[PDB]
Design a protein around this ligand. Structure first.
Ligand SMILES: Nc1ncnc2c1ncn2[C@@H]1O[C@H](COP(=O)(O)OP(=O)(O)O)[C@@H](O)[C@H]1O
Ligand SMILES: Nc1ncnc2c1ncn2[C@@H]1O[C@H](COP(=O)(O)OP(=O)(O)O)[C@@H](O)[C@H]1O
Ligand SMILES: Nc1ncnc2c1ncn2[C@@H]1O[C@H](COP(=O)(O)OP(=O)(O)O)[C@@H](O)[C@H]1O
Lengths: 112, 112, 112
């Protein structure tokens, strides 16, 4: 099992969710983050230090998938979330050691 | 060491925290997320596309525990966070490669 | 590749970001969390149960770095985020199985 974490442009959430649904992915968890990178927000200089005054929101998508699914999922997300412009974001894949569905106590692949 | 990530119903946070305290777990980190899954929010259809108009908040609990603790922790959380109804959520266990307490520089199990 | 996750005092974000920039780290992702631990917020007791009425915000910094960088990054963060007072937070290092830059499709170390 793999945890697929994608940091994407907020306006790409709907498109990514449809891609996952097409693969029959049953659910996912989403949170708000701020992004720092080559694309930067505006700053105001005070005493030699530049205070950030604008920020770039991103959406963090976390979806647990089986090993047999993960490559297809990463592919779908990349294609859905791509604009070709700077700031498009990242996909990080983390190994999951165990998964449990709280409602049933089902483990691993049967928990998703 | 393991990072135990639980996605739970917001009204179950207090109950989960008490369970962890009973195990002598010293601390944990909590964030707000939105959940998508078999339980769905309401949508409004515009031009063939259904815009989500209601969302289902969940709370993401992240607690780092020692290998000797992790199975007990996962068990406690599952029992505390369970309602038996759809939407109860998931527990994902991730391996931790290193941990540091910022205040002391203590490493691994002594950092918790 | 490693995902370095740091839970830090909010007023330490600027200092940590400068440390990473000094190492030539190109970007990072930041989110808001609440912290529970030895430092606690205030509570109000109702029917034997203590409702939390104040909370301690922390900032979660997540930065993916190469294996050759990770020890230096963990060191920089620890020194930047340290106050010596309780509540300073934690750094957890997670192994990354794969990384992709969404804009280019570049993989692993070339994605950062
Ligand atoms: N090393 C990193 N670790 C974690 N998140 C990162 C890292 N580098 C970039 N990001 C995230 O990716 C987003 C886009 O990065 P950026 O460098 O602006 O564009 P691109 O990803 O197109 O090269 C950033 O806003 C940040 O959220
Ligand atoms: N594959 C997944 N990866 C990450 N989070 C998930 C996944 N599937 C479900 N979730 C999270 O679990 C929550 C509950 O899932 P749901 O399918 O509604 O009910 P149940 O977990 O009882 O089957 C969702 O709101 C979502 O936050
Ligand atoms: N086992 C843990 N897993 C995840 N986060 C933790 C854990 N223990 C502490 N934390 C986080 O670290 C923060 C500081 O912890 P605390 O015990 O108050 O001080 P210190 O880290 O200086 O010992 C907490 O507010 C919480 O966010």
């Amino acid at each position: 099992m793999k945890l697929v974490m994608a940091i994407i442009k907020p306006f790409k959430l709907d498109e990514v969710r449809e891609a996952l649904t097409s693969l029959g992915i049953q659910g996912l968890t989403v949170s708000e983050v701020k992004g720092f990178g080559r694309q930067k927000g505006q700053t105001e200089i005070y005493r030699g230090a530049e205070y950030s005054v604008s920020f770039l929101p991103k959406v963090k998508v976390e979806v647990a998938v089986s090993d047999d699914q993960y490559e297809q999922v990463v592919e779908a997300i990349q294609k859905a979330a791509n604009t070709g412009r700077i700031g498009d974001g990242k996909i990080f894949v983390l190994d999951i050691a165990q998964a449990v569905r709280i409602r049933t106590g089902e483990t691993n692949t049967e928990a998703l």
